[PDB]
Amino acid sequence: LPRLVIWLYQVTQWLTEAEITTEAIWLLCTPEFSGNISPEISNLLNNLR
Amino acid sequence: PVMLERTRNLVAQLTQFGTSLLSMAEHDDADELTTLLLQQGMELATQS
């Protein structure tokens, strides 16, 4: 439990120092993904083939 | 060899057209920002 508390303090302080929002850090690291072929990916494939 | 020469001249001209299109868009969009800045300056001037 103290390890979790100190981990939460370090991360939140880092995010404020680096000016990274909670949503931004989630988008950078989460494994959850939409599963849909986005237009960015579709354009990448069409120019790549 | 002859067909390649004729085609290559046309393709080079096509590249020239694309260069002009990009250059013009850059200048036109630069004026768009300047026009917006002047309009915003007027609104600020009225409040001043």
Partner: protein
């Protein structure tokens, strides 16, 4: 309009190469030179 003519020249230039090498399987104009992501620009460079 110029891209339409230019790619047409490329195609008949490719057919001349097929006749000279007697190889109908070679393909060099693969399509997609005009791509919507660049509004048609960088088409001549691909054909070159």
């Amino acid at each position: 309009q110029f891209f339409d003519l230019t790619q047409s020249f490329c195609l008949m230039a490719q057919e001349a190469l097929r006749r000279e090498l007697t190889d109908n399987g070679v393909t060099f104009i693969r399509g997609g030179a005009w791509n919507g992501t660049t509004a048609g620009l960088m088409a001549g460079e691909t054909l070159l």
